[PDB]
């Protein structure tokens with residue numbers, strides 16, 4: 596009885612959830628505190644729209660905000676929808692959603708990539724979406740348990756592909772396609788490119804001496 600420990604050695608608190616991939620299927624794993632339980636995840640059905648059924652692209656940005664699942668935002672009739680690109684302004688295609696399943700995989704923080712738990716409780720308030728509250732930074736984060744005040748387990752919410760970020764070792768933030776360069780006498784030179792791939796990924800080229 597206690598927190599879960601994956602085969603890989605990763606550690607999840609009781610009541611946390613994460614995503615595991617078994618074969619061609621995506622599983623939703625929960626820590627029972629008695630063990631674990633994984634269940635196939637549902638794929639949100641898309642229909643109609645100007646995409647004509649094109650699958651969601653999550654997260655995506657609309658109206659200068661980031662959405663981690665379908666929304667009724669901007670709809671008068673309360674339909675659920677999702678853009679079919681990470682950037683709904685540049686491009687402008689969307690489609691309708693049948694269900695409102697919400698799975699937000701975090702990165703960084705102290706929750707080993709658990710899902711956002713909604714709602715989570717911070718400063719005695721229940722949040723049904725990621726937030727920047729308490730952050731001078733303005734990065735979006737979610738509680739990975741139902742109560743942050745008590746548990747204090749958090750993660751960083753995703754960013755639309757086009758808005759992804761790579762952070763330098765010293766901490767500076769770069770966007771996709773940006774290049775980071777370090778020069779050490781030319782004897783050693785290294786250039787890195789911010790690819791992101793959801794994981795703030797760098798791909799680098801270096802020479803030796």
Ligand SMILES: *[C@@H]1O[C@H](CO)[C@@H](O)[C@H](O)[C@H]1NC(C)=O
Nearest residue numbers: 714715716719720721722741
């Ligand atoms: C937050 O949600 C939890 C769910 O268990 C509930 O117990 C609590 O009353 C809620 N607090 C607020 C601010 O509504």
